[PDB]
Amino acid sequence: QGQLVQSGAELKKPGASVKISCKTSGYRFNFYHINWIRQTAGRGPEWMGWISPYSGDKNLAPAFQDRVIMTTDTEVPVTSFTSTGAAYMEIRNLKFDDTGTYFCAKGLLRDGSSTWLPYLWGQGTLLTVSSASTKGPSVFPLAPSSKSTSGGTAALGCLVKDYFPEPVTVSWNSGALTSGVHTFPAVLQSSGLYSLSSVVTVPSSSLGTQTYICNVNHKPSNTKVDKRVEPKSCDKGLEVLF
Amino acid sequence: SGGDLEITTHSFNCRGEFFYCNTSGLFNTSGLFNNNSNDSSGNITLPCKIKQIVRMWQRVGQAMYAPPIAGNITCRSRITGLLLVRDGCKSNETNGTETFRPAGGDMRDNWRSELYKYKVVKIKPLGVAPTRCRRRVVGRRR
Amino acid sequence: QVQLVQSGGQMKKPGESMRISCRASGYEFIDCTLNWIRLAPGKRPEWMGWLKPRGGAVNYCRPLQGRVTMTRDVYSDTAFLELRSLTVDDTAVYFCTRGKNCDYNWDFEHWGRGTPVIV
Amino acid sequence: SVLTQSASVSGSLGQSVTISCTGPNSVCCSHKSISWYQWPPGRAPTLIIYEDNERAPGISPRFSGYKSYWSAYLTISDLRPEDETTYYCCSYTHNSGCVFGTGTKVSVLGQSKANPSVTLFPPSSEELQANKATLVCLISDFYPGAVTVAWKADSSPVKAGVETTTPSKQSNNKYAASSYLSLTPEQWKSHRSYSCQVTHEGSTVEKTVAPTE
Amino acid sequence: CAPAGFAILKCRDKKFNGTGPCKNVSTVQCTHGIKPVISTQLLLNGSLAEGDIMIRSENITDNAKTIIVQLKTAVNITCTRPSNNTRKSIRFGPGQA
Amino acid sequence: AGDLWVTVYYGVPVWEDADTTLFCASDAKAYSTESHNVWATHACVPTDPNPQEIPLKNVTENFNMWKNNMVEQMHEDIISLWDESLKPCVKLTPL
Amino acid sequence: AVGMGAVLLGFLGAAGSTMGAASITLTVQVRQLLSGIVQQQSNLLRAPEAQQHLLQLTVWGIKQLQARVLAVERYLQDQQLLGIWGCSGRLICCTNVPWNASWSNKSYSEIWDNLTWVEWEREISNYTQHIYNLLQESQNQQEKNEQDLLALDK
Amino acid sequence: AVGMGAVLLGFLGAAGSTMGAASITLTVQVRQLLSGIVQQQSNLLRAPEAQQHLLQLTVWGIKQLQARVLAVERYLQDQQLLGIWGCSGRLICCTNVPWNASWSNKSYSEIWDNLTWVEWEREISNYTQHIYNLLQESQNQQEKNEQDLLALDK
Amino acid sequence: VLTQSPGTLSLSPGETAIISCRTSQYGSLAWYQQRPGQAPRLVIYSGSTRAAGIPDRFSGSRWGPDYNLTISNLESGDFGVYYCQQYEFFGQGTKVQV
Numbered sequence A: 001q002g003q004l005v006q007s008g009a010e011l012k013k014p015g016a017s018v019k020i021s022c023k024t025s026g027y028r029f030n031f032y033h034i035n036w037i038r039q040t041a042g043r044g045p046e047w048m049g050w051i052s053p054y055s056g057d058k059n060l061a062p063a064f065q066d067r068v069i070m071t072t073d074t075e076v077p078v079t080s081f082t083s084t085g086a087a088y089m090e091i092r093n094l095k096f097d098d099t100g101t102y103f104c105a106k107g108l109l110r111d112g113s114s115t116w117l118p119y120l121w122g123q124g125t126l127l128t129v130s131s132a133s134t135k136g137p138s139v140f141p142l143a144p145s146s147k148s149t150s151g152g153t154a155a156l157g158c159l160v161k162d163y164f165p166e167p168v169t170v171s172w173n174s175g176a177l178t179s180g181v182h183t184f185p186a187v188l189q190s191s192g193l194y195s196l197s198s199v200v201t202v203p204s205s206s207l208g209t210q211t212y213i214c215n216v217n218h219k220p221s222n223t224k225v226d227k228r229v230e231p232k233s234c235d236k237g238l239e240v241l242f
Numbered sequence B: 001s002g003g004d005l006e007i008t009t010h011s012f013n014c015r016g017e018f019f020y021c022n023t024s025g026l027f028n029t030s031g032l033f034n035n036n037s038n039d040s041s042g043n044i045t046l047p048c049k050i051k052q053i054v055r056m057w058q059r060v061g062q063a064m065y066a067p068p069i070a071g072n073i074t075c076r077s078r079i080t081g082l083l084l085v086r087d088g089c090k091s092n093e094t095n096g097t098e099t100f101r102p103a104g105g106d107m108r109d110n111w112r113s114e115l116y117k118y119k120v121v122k123i124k125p126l127g128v129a130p131t132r133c134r135r136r137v138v139g140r141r142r
Numbered sequence C: 001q002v003q004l005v006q007s008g009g010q011m012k013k014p015g016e017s018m019r020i021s022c023r024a025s026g027y028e029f030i031d032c033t034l035n036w037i038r039l040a041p042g043k044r045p046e047w048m049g050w051l052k053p054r055g056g057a058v059n060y061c062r063p064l065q066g067r068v069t070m071t072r073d074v075y076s077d078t079a080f081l082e083l084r085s086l087t088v089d090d091t092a093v094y095f096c097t098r099g100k101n102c103d104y105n106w107d108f109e110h111w112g113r114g115t116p117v118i119v
Numbered sequence D: 001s002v003l004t005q006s007a008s009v010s011g012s013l014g015q016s017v018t019i020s021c022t023g024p025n026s027v028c029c030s031h032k033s034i035s036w037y038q039w040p041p042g043r044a045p046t047l048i049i050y051e052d053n054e055r056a057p058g059i060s061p062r063f064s065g066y067k068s069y070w071s072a073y074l075t076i077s078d079l080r081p082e083d084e085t086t087y088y089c090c091s092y093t094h095n096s097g098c099v100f101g102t103g104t105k106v107s108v109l110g111q112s113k114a115n116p117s118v119t120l121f122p123p124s125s126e127e128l129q130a131n132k133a134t135l136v137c138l139i140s141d142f143y144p145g146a147v148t149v150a151w152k153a154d155s156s157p158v159k160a161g162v163e164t165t166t167p168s169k170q171s172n173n174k175y176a177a178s179s180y181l182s183l184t185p186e187q188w189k190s191h192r193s194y195s196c197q198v199t200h201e202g203s204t205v206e207k208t209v210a211p212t213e
Numbered sequence E: 001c002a003p004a005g006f007a008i009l010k011c012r013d014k015k016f017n018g019t020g021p022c023k024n025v026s027t028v029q030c031t032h033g034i035k036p037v038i039s040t041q042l043l044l045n046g047s048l049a050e051g052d053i054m055i056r057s058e059n060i061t062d063n064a065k066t067i068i069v070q071l072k073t074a075v076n077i078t079c080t081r082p083s084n085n086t087r088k089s090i091r092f093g094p095g096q097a
Numbered sequence F: 001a002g003d004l005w006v007t008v009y010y011g012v013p014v015w016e017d018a019d020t021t022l023f024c025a026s027d028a029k030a031y032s033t034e035s036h037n038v039w040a041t042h043a044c045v046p047t048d049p050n051p052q053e054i055p056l057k058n059v060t061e062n063f064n065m066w067k068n069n070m071v072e073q074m075h076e077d078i079i080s081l082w083d084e085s086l087k088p089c090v091k092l093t094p095l
Numbered sequence G, H: 001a002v003g004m005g006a007v008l009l010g011f012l013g014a015a016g017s018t019m020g021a022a023s024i025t026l027t028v029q030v031r032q033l034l035s036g037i038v039q040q041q042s043n044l045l046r047a048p049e050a051q052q053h054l055l056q057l058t059v060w061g062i063k064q065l066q067a068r069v070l071a072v073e074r075y076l077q078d079q080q081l082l083g084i085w086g087c088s089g090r091l092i093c094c095t096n097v098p099w100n101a102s103w104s105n106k107s108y109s110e111i112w113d114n115l116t117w118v119e120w121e122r123e124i125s126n127y128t129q130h131i132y133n134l135l136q137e138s139q140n141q142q143e144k145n146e147q148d149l150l151a152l153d154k
Numbered sequence I: 001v002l003t004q005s006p007g008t009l010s011l012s013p014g015e016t017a018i019i020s021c022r023t024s025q026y027g028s029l030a031w032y033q034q035r036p037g038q039a040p041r042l043v044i045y046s047g048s049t050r051a052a053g054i055p056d057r058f059s060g061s062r063w064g065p066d067y068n069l070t071i072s073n074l075e076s077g078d079f080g081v082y083y084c085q086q087y088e089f090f091g092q093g094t095k096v097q098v
């Protein structure tokens, strides 16, 4: 039932400060430690610290003891055994190689040799410390394409191009359609920009009737895009059924 | 807006005599604060009516006659709260407003006013839970 | 079951007054709150004010503030309402109404039989 | 990490496979408690084991643990398609942060095969209105993920402007990738046949789309 | 006071609403000293609010339910019957007066 | 031939909401026995000089002042004490 | 974690604490069942004969008696129960009844190091009286076995 | 012969049954001593505070209190007795007191496989309180022997 | 405060009728039918809760600002004008007739 939700992505100048959030829900906040772990560029995982919402007792790894600042809010009781809460982490003087996925994680037990142990991890919060500016997603629509035309199936989607930094969160039909959706990854080009593609596999029958719209967003560059996918294809690949 | 005297007035007793003070003065309004160079501000006196034959709790309980205390009397209480009730109907949406009036019908609100921070529970001392302890000649190998 | 028997509907003229009673039974007259909801041609059922028969505590609807006067004889268990400065528009059938329970006034399961006043 | 676990281990579906964890007397092992996480890259990890012997809630008895005086271990049996992720160990005490292992990626041998479902798209009018037109090809639902790319405009090996992505695992337990081709609408009109061909265990399927052929 | 095996729970939240969770609770066997004051409109000689003045109601929207205000700082009210009224005993037997 | 068994604990720290009879305890500072009080009667047990209030650490408890038998208890006590107090007193019906 | 002398004063003091930690405070909850919450700084004279008039029939008089008798009324039920489970005079009593995963499938630490009693009793809320019935059914199947033994035993 | 769950419901169910068979039903008779006969299909809320008026001084009000207190009054006597026999918390308690043929000279089976308890208690009707006195006299001669032992034991 | 949609709508005994009601602020929403000569009888009060003697035909539903009222198997004894109540605020009203 428990649930830890972290803040959105941020792009920071090297040498700058930043504060990451972690809003908890579904369980008693002060009953469990909140940890902080990051996935470094070439150093894999990396536990940074933990903190008690109850006692305020901290434990920071020697590496960050004078770099990051663990803090917490007071719990708001929801039920007899559930409460909302918020936890933070301010890693100042951001050096490079700090770019990675930052995690908060609640403890395991309440009494024992493994109380603080990271059990319920959050979403992650991708940090990108860099000089490079921010750039939005140039959203275009992808025309219909029948893969297995003998049966009649097909696929449509949206192409995200020329943007930085990651990530991009795509959705279909105002955040309702889930069946057949598939968001591919992306690569660092020569320039430095990123670019993904999101496909929702649906046939060429319900083209002129049902609506399909890609709901693309980019928190670092702060953009929210809605695009109508055109039901048309002047090519010999799909034009067989009609 | 109406009711028994005790409800349309401020009621209480000092040294035993039961009072019914006109709270009209306390509710004229005077909401906009200018202070008027700190003038026109001393006491605010309410006319009080006094009665001896008195019946509380309505029907339950008999009527009581309060014998007079000889000589003049005066008591000081501290006002620690109020009991209000809102006039409610459709009115001017913008920029209209709601008006409030005093109520004293049910004494239970006096009791709720003090007890709000309390609740009573029953303790349930019996408890049952799994354990690697069996009975008779065993408590896990010994 | 409870029931609220009512008065006969009198015939009146504008610029006058009216008084219509309502006797209750089957429940402790004091413990529960009674309302007065009249119904005119075509308009939404108009609530005029509730009456708590403990100490005659009342709460009148804004347009009726001045004309309406809800009282009660706690001894004869009768609910009274006076309405002065009459109009042909305030003409309606009148219904004394108490809720489902004493914990909530607004679920009017119990209505009295309509009293028809003519102006 | 200082606490070194194995690089990569191979297991056979249905049977078991072990992962070791070891370091100096400090990071391991006596007077040090050991935990284990499956950490699917790109997703939040999952605690499998915490007190070496002990398993997290809802965890299968498949996963079992053992710590000797010098090494920690992790048996995982009745192998499944979902166990092809990378796992981590950690050494900790009752009052001290985790010292994560170096990581161990796991391969589940003797599983079925799937063919890359290609879906090539043309550059939309919006792209052609820039003017900057790029081709969009995407393979999916294939394993093993060890695949390679070979674009062909008029049956020629293309160099500049061709960017490919590393194959990622899916909710279908299979691997998937994607590759693009950035050019201009002037080049797009036209250079014979723009083909998108990709290989996997010999099977090199092709799904082509061109403006003339 | 509650019987044995029972207990009263006291909400120590300084900005309590009346309903719902209490973060700061304490068990007691007996309620603190409560004077039974019978008054109307004005609540006399009672307990003030710790945080700030408080409004409480089962639901404010239901106009038929009393608003209960709790001041933070008390307001002295001094009432009086100023006349020197002499009293007489009037007997009617046997010694009933 | 098992692993886990039912084990019984007495003195377990659990409670449930409950309605019960509540008795009264008075501060006992009323020296004058002659001038006795209608509410703080002789039946009120003497107060504790030290009121022990135990902080329930880690406890969140739900309240609802609007459904609390204490006030109905308190209310019916009040009107019963008032009635009992004039029960012995003289009737004034000849007036 | 507090001292042995404080444990005595801390009624319901391990209420929000973990189930394993609550065991030091079993006696203090028990003592309350009859005597209410303990008094420290002051310990007045609680002897008999404090009703010197007809005050035993008044509001408080009756109320007190009701509260006094109810208090023991309830105490005995809890005892009699423990008794017919064969756990008389035990604050922690092992039984013959095996635990059922359907009741709960949490490990030791998943309970004792993770739950509060009221929290756990709420989980076992449904299966409780049925257990109470097994506890008692066990005790009987024991008493049966004893008479069985007394028969073969000449 | 019925099931373990029925045994719980069958108060005085082995009344006409043989003495040996009655032992499975000892707990169910005990539970009745305070709570009366058990209820199965329905189990209502038996909590406190059901007297909302001056009804505690009425016919039934007084009667109930009398019945409530008498019920525990008696329960304790039976317990205190078992206690000073050294049989506290035992539904079947062995003693040091040897049986007397004058009391009864029936074999095991002549009793346990042939008599009902009320039948047998009627035979032992005369010699009962005297036994109750030996049971208690034994317990004392035990306590004496312990103090004896504490003296030699330094 | 209460926009009782629709305006007015009468139909046959066979077709199942549906009446909705918009909401400004939270509050218990009830309904009443004004039959010939009779008083507005309570039919559905909390939302999904039926009154004394109300058959399964009547059924209330929906979450959020809107709230519905549904009855099948209509009769001449089910004629009259309905109303939508919230606190002291009523709705316009909708009717089924000949």
Ligand SMILES: *[C@@H]1O[C@H](CO)[C@@H](O[C@@H]2O[C@H](CO)[C@@H](O[C@@H]3O[C@H](CO[C@H]4O[C@H](CO[C@H]5O[C@H](CO)[C@@H](O)[C@H](O)[C@@H]5O[C@H]5O[C@H](CO)[C@@H](O)[C@H](O)[C@@H]5O)[C@@H](O)[C@H](O[C@H]5O[C@H](CO)[C@@H](O)[C@H](O)[C@@H]5O[C@H]5O[C@H](CO)[C@@H](O)[C@H](O)[C@@H]5O)[C@@H]4O)[C@@H](O)[C@H](O[C@H]4O[C@H](CO)[C@@H](O)[C@H](O)[C@@H]4O[C@H]4O[C@H](CO)[C@@H](O)[C@H](O)[C@@H]4O[C@H]4O[C@H](CO)[C@@H](O)[C@H](O)[C@@H]4O)[C@@H]3O)[C@H](O)[C@H]2NC(C)=O)[C@H](O)[C@H]1NC(C)=O
Pocket (backbone or CB within 6 Å): B012, B013, B014, B015, B016, B068, B069, B070, B071, B072, B074, B075, B076, B077, B078, E037, E038, E039, E044, E045, F032, F034, F035, F036
């Ligand atoms: C809220 O709250 C508030 C507060 O809390 C409140 O208020 C309050 O109230 C209360 C009550 O009411 C009060 O108290 C009261 O008071 C009163 C007065 O005082 C004063 O005086 C006294 C004396 O007396 C005398 O005088 C007077 C005048 O002055 C008069 O009035 C009277 O009556 C008397 O007379 C007498 O004498 C004369 C001569 O002179 C003759 O002529 C005649 O005949 C007679 O004989 C005195 O004593 C006092 O003193 C006090 O004070 C001072 C200061 O000021 C001090 O120096 C002193 O010492 C004293 O003090 C003490 O205490 C305190 C505490 O309290 C402390 O603090 C100190 O330190 C000390 O210790 C003055 O000066 C009086 O009177 C009263 O008494 C009464 O009551 C009580 C109860 O309450 C009791 O206890 C007593 O015993 C008495 O009793 C009586 O009465 C009652 C009724 O009232 C009854 O029931 C009884 O039984 C008896 O009876 C008898 O007698 C009567 C007469 O008295 C008659 O009528 C009958 O019939 C019989 O015979 C009290 O104390 C207060 O004050 C107040 N406060 C304020 C601030 O205000 C309120 O209420 C509330 N509210 C609500 C709503 O709740």
Ligand SMILES: *[C@@H]1O[C@H](CO)[C@@H](O[C@@H]2O[C@H](CO)[C@@H](O[C@@H]3O[C@H](CO[C@H]4O[C@H](CO[C@H]5O[C@H](CO)[C@@H](O)[C@H](O)[C@@H]5O[C@H]5O[C@H](CO)[C@@H](O)[C@H](O)[C@@H]5O)[C@@H](O)[C@H](O[C@H]5O[C@H](CO)[C@@H](O)[C@H](O)[C@@H]5O[C@H]5O[C@H](CO)[C@@H](O)[C@H](O)[C@@H]5O)[C@@H]4O)[C@@H](O)[C@H](O[C@H]4O[C@H](CO)[C@@H](O)[C@H](O)[C@@H]4O[C@H]4O[C@H](CO)[C@@H](O)[C@H](O)[C@@H]4O)[C@@H]3O)[C@H](O)[C@H]2NC(C)=O)[C@H](O)[C@H]1NC(C)=O
Pocket (backbone or CB within 6 Å): B042, B043, B076, E078, E079
């Ligand atoms: C809105 O409504 C409000 C409520 O409705 C209104 O509130 C009212 O406001 C009034 C003022 O505005 C208040 O009036 C004040 O009263 C006090 C009362 O003190 C006297 O009584 C005490 C006990 O009663 C005795 O006296 C009375 C009267 O004589 C007798 O009837 C009694 O029987 C009893 O008799 C005994 O004493 C006499 C001798 O006095 C003997 O002969 C008898 O045998 C008895 O033994 C009493 O203790 C006082 O005695 C002290 O003062 C005497 C002088 O007055 C002195 O001789 C004594 O020795 C004694 O002093 C010593 O003892 C005290 C003990 O505490 C020591 O503190 C002190 O230091 C000495 O050691 C007194 O007899 C009255 O004192 C007040 O007077 C002050 O305020 C006025 C305001 O106008 C000033 O002008 C005065 O100067 C005075 O200021 C004093 O304090 C200054 C320092 O701050 C100091 O510098 C001054 O020199 C001076 O000492 C008030 O008059 C009223 O109480 C109040 N009511 C309520 C319910 O709140 C409000 O007004 C209204 N407003 C509006 C705008 O509408």
Ligand SMILES: *[C@@H]1O[C@H](CO)[C@@H](O[C@@H]2O[C@H](CO)[C@@H](O[C@@H]3O[C@H](CO[C@H]4O[C@H](CO)[C@@H](O)[C@H](O[C@H]5O[C@H](CO)[C@@H](O)[C@H](O)[C@@H]5O[C@H]5O[C@H](CO)[C@@H](O)[C@H](O)[C@@H]5O)[C@@H]4O)[C@@H](O)[C@H](O[C@H]4O[C@H](CO)[C@@H](O)[C@H](O)[C@@H]4O[C@H]4O[C@H](CO)[C@@H](O)[C@H](O)[C@@H]4O[C@H]4O[C@H](CO)[C@@H](O)[C@H](O)[C@@H]4O)[C@@H]3O)[C@H](O)[C@H]2NC(C)=O)[C@H](O)[C@H]1NC(C)=O
Pocket (backbone or CB within 6 Å): E059, E061, I026, I027, I028, I063, I064, I065
């Ligand atoms: C006495 O007086 C009191 C008042 O003093 C009365 O109290 C209230 O009574 C009402 C009932 O009478 C109680 O019930 C609430 O009903 C709400 C109605 O919601 C409907 O209408 C809204 C209109 O906006 C609509 O959004 C809802 O549907 C949405 O969700 C579904 C599922 O996702 C989706 O299918 C819909 O299309 C809607 O979602 C779309 O639209 C949204 C528009 O904002 C978008 O945000 C969304 O992304 C999507 O595009 C629904 O149809 C209901 O909303 C209330 O839920 C509250 O409270 C619950 C507890 O009661 C709690 O469990 C919920 O999570 C929610 O809490 C939200 O707010 C708090 C504020 O801090 C957050 O912490 C929560 O996490 C949550 O916010 C998050 O989630 C939101 C939705 O995802 C999101 O917008 C937001 O940004 C956060 O991310 C209730 O169920 C009500 O609880 C009572 N109290 C109060 C305070 O209102 C009382 O009745 C009266 N007594 C009597 C007898 O009458």
Ligand SMILES: *[C@@H]1O[C@H](CO)[C@@H](O[C@@H]2O[C@H](CO)[C@@H](O[C@@H]3O[C@H](CO[C@H]4O[C@H](CO[C@H]5O[C@H](CO)[C@@H](O)[C@H](O)[C@@H]5O[C@H]5O[C@H](CO)[C@@H](O)[C@H](O)[C@@H]5O)[C@@H](O)[C@H](O[C@H]5O[C@H](CO)[C@@H](O)[C@H](O)[C@@H]5O)[C@@H]4O)[C@@H](O)[C@H](O[C@H]4O[C@H](CO)[C@@H](O)[C@H](O)[C@@H]4O[C@H]4O[C@H](CO)[C@@H](O)[C@H](O)[C@@H]4O)[C@@H]3O)[C@H](O)[C@H]2NC(C)=O)[C@H](O)[C@H]1NC(C)=O
Pocket (backbone or CB within 6 Å): B078, E073, E074, E075, E076
């Ligand atoms: C409703 O109406 C009511 C009636 O009108 C009204 O009641 C009255 O309210 C006032 C408050 O406004 C009551 O209190 C008065 O307050 C004055 C100010 O108090 C300040 O001083 C206190 C004492 O300071 C000691 O320590 C200092 C340290 O250096 C010394 O400098 C002082 O000299 C003093 O010395 C101490 O040590 C000496 C050693 O040698 C020793 O002799 C001496 O006696 C004393 O012990 C402070 O404690 C106080 O500060 C506290 O609070 C603040 C925060 O608020 C903290 O920061 C502090 O740390 C501290 O905790 C104040 O600064 C007092 O001057 C006034 O004096 C009366 O009482 C003293 C004894 O305390 C008497 O000696 C003196 O004679 C005064 O008369 C009293 O006695 C007579 C005779 O019995 C009696 O008739 C008279 O009525 C009065 O009781 C007094 O304390 C006042 O008492 C109330 N009166 C009544 C009748 O109730 C009420 O407010 C109204 N309410 C509303 C809402 O409207």
Ligand SMILES: *[C@@H]1O[C@H](CO)[C@@H](O[C@@H]2O[C@H](CO)[C@@H](O[C@@H]3O[C@H](CO[C@H]4O[C@H](CO[C@H]5O[C@H](CO)[C@@H](O)[C@H](O)[C@@H]5O)[C@@H](O)[C@H](O[C@H]5O[C@H](CO)[C@@H](O)[C@H](O)[C@@H]5O)[C@@H]4O)[C@@H](O)[C@H](O[C@H]4O[C@H](CO)[C@@H](O)[C@H](O)[C@@H]4O[C@H]4O[C@H](CO)[C@@H](O)[C@H](O)[C@@H]4O)[C@@H]3O)[C@H](O)[C@H]2NC(C)=O)[C@H](O)[C@H]1NC(C)=O
Pocket (backbone or CB within 6 Å): A030, A031, A032, A033, A052, A053, A054, A055, A057, A058, A059, A060, A110, A111, A112, A113, A114, A115, D094, D095, D096, F057, F058, G001, G013, G014, G016, G017, G018
């Ligand atoms: C209400 O709810 C809350 C929240 O659920 C409950 O609080 C929970 O309480 C439990 C039990 O008390 C805690 O578990 C314990 O966690 C500690 C963690 O250690 C921290 O504190 C160390 C010092 O602790 C003392 O000081 C603090 C104040 O700071 C006091 O509050 C304590 O009570 C103690 O007096 C500290 O040394 C550690 O810091 C390390 O790092 C820093 C930074 O570098 C350095 O400064 C330090 O020097 C140190 O290096 C750390 O911050 C554990 O120590 C406990 O483990 C012992 O006990 C276990 C069994 O309970 C056992 O499994 C362990 O192995 C260990 O065993 C002990 O005994 C062994 C016997 O052989 C010894 O060999 C062994 O060395 C050890 O001495 C325990 O796990 C929860 O953390 C806590 N929850 C939260 C969120 O904080 C509360 O109980 C509830 N109830 C009430 C009534 O409040």
Ligand SMILES: *[C@@H]1O[C@H](CO)[C@@H](O[C@@H]2O[C@H](CO)[C@@H](O[C@@H]3O[C@H](CO)[C@@H](O)[C@H](O)[C@@H]3O)[C@H](O)[C@H]2NC(C)=O)[C@H](O)[C@H]1NC(C)=O
Pocket (backbone or CB within 6 Å): A001, A002, A026, A027, A108, A109, D057, D058, G110, G114, G115, G119
């Ligand atoms: C400490 O105790 C809490 C209970 O108060 C444990 O939380 C519970 O954990 C289970 C999973 O372990 C949650 O879901 C379960 O899911 C299965 C199906 O997957 C279902 O069959 C179960 O009935 C149960 O729903 C459960 O919701 C959750 N309870 C709460 C209130 O969050 C917690 O895991 C314990 N801590 C440890 C370390 O074990």
Ligand SMILES: *[C@@H]1O[C@H](CO)[C@@H](O[C@@H]2O[C@H](CO)[C@@H](O)[C@H](O)[C@H]2NC(C)=O)[C@H](O)[C@H]1NC(C)=O
Pocket (backbone or CB within 6 Å): D057, D058, D059, G105, G106, G110
């Ligand atoms: C108690 O049993 C429930 C099932 O009755 C456990 O639920 C587990 O849920 C996960 C969900 O991914 C499954 O993978 C497991 O197979 C389930 N376990 C079992 C035994 O069925 C639950 O985790 C168990 N523990 C607790 C604390 O509830």
Ligand SMILES: *[C@@H]1O[C@H](CO)[C@@H](O)[C@H](O)[C@H]1NC(C)=O
Pocket (backbone or CB within 6 Å): B024, B025, B026, B028, B029, B030, B044, B045, B046
């Ligand atoms: C309020 O009423 C009081 C009555 O005492 C009066 O003195 C005051 O002037 C009034 N103020 C207003 C604004 O009516």
